[PDB]
């Protein structure tokens, strides 16, 4: 499969 | 006026640094913070930097800039679509799995590129910039946006000027989300963004490492709202050039692709040091080129990507569960969960696509409803670890009695959660059918409708499972394995 799949707009923590 | 903004931002920093006044007054706090942010925004001049041309006037420069640095620029065109906004449209037939889009690392905006920019000195001093790469990217965008000779100007000038994240909602549009799960994340997003703006506004004025930044002369709330919304709706995780770590990056050109259902077909090529996208499906000439963003929920799509996706097969709602310290079997249950790698209390998920619960939630619910005798069998003896190994497997129940108990509990809990909403499913559908609403209002109402529809389906699926395992118990069927 994809070794480094790229997630468009991956959710990060902003707290 | 400069001293007045200092007083308002200081008041905003203190109000947004206060602890939560309890969930019963979070709406009042939200409106209070909105009032101060809007007062600051009305006294500021919007975005510090605006461009004279239209958004589509700069797309040819994006293509020329990306082509000069080795990116794919043929086979597609930029089109302003009604549903999704601007996106890519094929100008030739593109077959599924064809590598049609690639973007070398030199074009990307990364935390590493932020560290080596004019933001460098301030980055090396501020602990929030060092710990939060997403916020670092936001200021990387702002500093380069206000730099006329920036290498990334062709990308920044083609970015949107506004978004549909909840930061842009009107008060009555957020009000639709009262009594839902999602509104608390909307509250947190607004409070965090307001606190961060006031924090960095004061930091930029007090830190000598920010004297060379254009933000020293102008840094409005509109700037920060646009910057964090640009990042949250478009940022990506990629490996470092070493390949040993992960970092956050904005990927020009490719991030113009809008979302449809499918699988992730975008990956980073470490040997050629570039982001590569293969066609998710066949795209005929004249059809929009879509990608699959990820298996995110509609709550995450609304709050962090600024849109609601009707065909979201990965939608889910949160459910908080934990073993009560008042339980007589608390110690044994917590130990079984510990040996299974499951915390004693956690936030689980209820999915719309069957099965409604994951293996981790199934294992928790099984232990949650175990008898003392069943807990002993998962703690002692040569088969205890084998029993732990199958806790998340639907085909290997602990007992028919344990299944009936856990599905009865889930049915009751999901039905109780449905009673905590201020509107019903039928009322939400009536509002969407009989009222004329903005895009942002529809997002909020569809979101609260989606939460209840997932809970309603979980009630039906748990009731069905309860009847299935009650039949096995009354028929005295042999337990599997
Ligand atoms: N399926 C969709 N339905 C509605 N809006 C979408 C959809 N997919 C993407 N979007 C929008 O596109 C944004 C993500 C962008 N990176 C994609 C290009 C964007 N449409 C633009 O004009 O720059 C999201 O925040 C949405 O506003």
Residue numbers in the entry:
A (entry chain Y): 66 to 80
B (entry chain A): 20 to 500
How does the study describe this entry?
Here we elucidate the structural and molecular determinant(s) of target specificity of histidine vs. lysine in the active site of SETD3. On the substrate-binding surface, the residues are diverse, reflecting the fact that the three enzymes act on three very distinct substrates—the large subunit of Rubisco by LSMT, RelA subunit of nuclear factor NFκB by SETD6, and actin by SETD3—with limited sequence similarity immediately surrounding the methylation target. To facilitate the methyl transfer reaction, SETD3 provides a local environment that promotes deprotonation of the target nitrogen N3 of histidine (and concomitant protonation of N1). Most (if not all) SAM-dependent MTases use the classic SN2 reaction mechanism, which requires the target nitrogen be in a deprotonated state.
First, we used the SAM analog sinefungin (adenosyl ornithine) to prepare a complex mimicking the pre-reactive state. Like SAM, sinefungin also carries a formal positive charge, but does not support the methyl transfer, and thus functions as an inhibitor. The target histidine’s imidazole ring is nearly parallel to the aromatic ring of Tyr312, and, to maximize the H-bond potential of both nitrogen atoms, the imidazole ring is positioned such that N3 donates a proton to the main-chain carbonyl oxygen atom of Asp274 (N3–H•••O = C), while the N1 accepts a proton from a water molecule (numbered as w1). This water molecule is coordinated adjacent to the histidine-binding pocket, and is saturated with four H-bonds, three of which are at a traditional H-bond distance from the interacting atoms: the N1 atom of the histidine (2.8 Å), the main-chain carbonyl oxygen atom of Thr252 (2.6 Å) and the side-chain hydroxyl oxygen atom of Ser324 (2.7 Å). The fourth H-bond to w1 is weak and is within a distance of 3.4–3.5 Å from the main-chain carbonyl oxygen of the target histidine, the Cα atom of actin residue G74, or one of the guanidino nitrogen atoms of Arg315. The main difference between the pre-reactive and post-reactive complex structures is that the imidazole ring of methylated His73 rotated away from that of histidine.
